Amino acid sequence: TYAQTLQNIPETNVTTLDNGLRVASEESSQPTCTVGVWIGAGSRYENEKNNGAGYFVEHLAFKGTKKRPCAAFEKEVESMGAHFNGYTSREQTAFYIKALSKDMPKVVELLADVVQNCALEESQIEKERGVILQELKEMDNDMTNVTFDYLHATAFQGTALARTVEGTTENIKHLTRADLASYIDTHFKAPRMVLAAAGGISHKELVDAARQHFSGVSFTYKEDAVPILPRCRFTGSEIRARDDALPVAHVALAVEGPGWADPDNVVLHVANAIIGRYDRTFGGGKHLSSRLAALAVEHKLCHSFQTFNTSYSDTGLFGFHFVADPLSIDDMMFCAQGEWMRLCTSTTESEVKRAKNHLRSAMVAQLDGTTPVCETIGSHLLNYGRRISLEEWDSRISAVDARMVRDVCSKYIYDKCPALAAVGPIEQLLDYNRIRSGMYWI
Amino acid sequence: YKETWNTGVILLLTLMATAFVGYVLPWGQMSFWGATVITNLFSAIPYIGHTLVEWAWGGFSVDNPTLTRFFALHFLLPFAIAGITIIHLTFLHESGSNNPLGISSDSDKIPFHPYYSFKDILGLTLMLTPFLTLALFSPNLLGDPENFTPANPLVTPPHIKPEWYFLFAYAILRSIPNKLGGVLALAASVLILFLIPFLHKSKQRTMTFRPLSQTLFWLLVANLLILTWIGSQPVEHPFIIIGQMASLSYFTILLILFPTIGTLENKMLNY
């Protein structure tokens, strides 16, 4: 029974290493497991000349280490059935491995090696250069993203956040064994990292292995100092990339967010739960509960749309993104901005109750497996400081009510200048002004 | 056809007002007095009316200031009618003509021309005839004579009564003894139309297949004839009582019978 199953979930253990780094884990009766290093690094922490290092690095983090080059490293990992994966976004890089709880320790070693003693054989770089260079030309055709990026690039413009996590085309072309080093150098440091694990592992056993390979001690106090980032200025504006030869069109609209810390992020989510999401394959179709959805069917408004609450350390982007035919863009937008409004004005207790029960399931969902748990933990700590339990989250959610939503949405949505990203055959979206006004009264 | 209807009603209202002013122009006894009797009703409204009137007259009684402004008004309104008429026909062309049977015509529609353009012109002649016939052989058959006597504010005509087309209303106005009430009754006597739509209960549209409603309908029509007649008569028994009744039944039908007999009708079809 719910109310109870939430407590039985084993508390997550956290103990920091006297050298800055931290360790956390959730032990379960599972044979398999997952562990990884969640570095608080990103494209935000980059700059004009280096833009793209954290990615170029992410690329060379597996082509060997000094201790054991490409062949052996790869061989060593495949041969034990482990899965070494990882990513790297604007404010969070992460390298993690999936394997039998048996390899628990031996694993850490690997992780540890990669971050610290990464090979960086200059012969492999000139090879990884042409690679990224392709990943761009290929990622350069995923409008859903091309959009979000452009969205960021204007939402923040003239700030670190307005940068692609893949970096410029130039940077990729000229980055050097040098700078690549520098990034890892300056960025991959103990305090700014979290060793996370969940599966059939005892905090003890784990914590130790870390104490064994994560031994690098800090002398001064500066090596203990977590660099605070210069905030990014939000700018109500728009960027329109027109190409009428594009089959469909993408549109992203957003407002400045509150940042990881702020509690309202929860509310904001409950909200997004109400406007939900949709793609032409949802089966509920005209009967769906999200008013925006339904209409999108009753009028063929779009192809897909989604509400998102991206949260960064000190900021965030709140909004929605839809894809649609060149001739329904308008109606669609209209309806969307509309719904948004209703949020601040006539949201009901039924809409919330539903949104809450949806959110609950959505949160629980993010923790389906080991990989998804360490991700959360790697994140929770790094971002929130502590680690929030489903029992906590849940309560924080049960506390929200209609009245509460209308107030928070009103706070971050009502009469605010927003950021707009239009890409494709967008001759119908037109005029910020109009789009602006759609930010009040409804 | 809600819109097409409401625009209609307005059109009527405008037409009514329009004549009303046009009548004053010849400034004959009836011209004058009809003005005074009617305009004087407005003074029954509380507070905000005793003024509305002296404003409307441009003075303290129907006089030149009025005549002149009425003429201007009579020049104007027709155009405003033409205008709305355009909107009327538009809301119509949004659905097309309703047909005597009350069932989808899509299964068989014909081009206005020459079918209805031809029908229309015949219809025209079949009317224009008596119109000319009366207007060429019996000019004043309709018009009261007191209007051949130059208006004189000092002397009042024996009987003050409008043109037939305002009679029915006149009769209802005069049925209620209380300027204010009678005014309301007059207003509502015509305003009521707007309600009609919201007072349809039959599962069918036209009365073609609804015998009951039909007679209630003809009872209503005749009910107007009576009101008309009652309006061309003075305020003495029996008239008065007959008067109040007729009006009483007029509203009763459009308000209670019609919608009720409609429902009841539906159940006999077993719907």
Binding site: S350 | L101, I103, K203, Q204, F209, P211, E265, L269
Partner: protein
């Protein structure tokens, strides 16, 4: 107590849409509901309903009716739409009350 039936049958002949060869449900005014039901009608039943009307109109335009032998009869009138209808009204009535919740 055949009072009712006697009446219903009366009124039925009273309204006399049979004279046109119509079915009770043909004469139904096409409000949103009816509009829906009709769309659900199986090809045949719908195509039949159609002709009947197109026939009826042609009569009315002609100012004629069907010969007494062809009129429809109270008990032979097939309420082909009622069922489809009721359900629509049921389906809607559901939705409606659920959006209040």
């Amino acid at each position: 107590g055949r009072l009712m039936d006697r009446i219903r049958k009366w009124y039925y002949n009273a309204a006399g849409f049979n004279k046109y060869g119509l079915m009770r449900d043909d004469t139904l005014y096409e409000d949103d509901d009816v509009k829906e039901a009709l769309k659900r009608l199986p090809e045949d039943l719908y195509n039949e309903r159609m002709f009947r009307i197109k026939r009826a109109l042609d009569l009315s335009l002609k100012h004629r009716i069907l010969p007494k032998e062809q009129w429809v009869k109270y008990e032979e009138d097939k309420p082909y739409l009622e069922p489809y209808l009721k359900e629509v009204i049921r389906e809607r009535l559901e939705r409606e009350a659920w959006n209040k919740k």
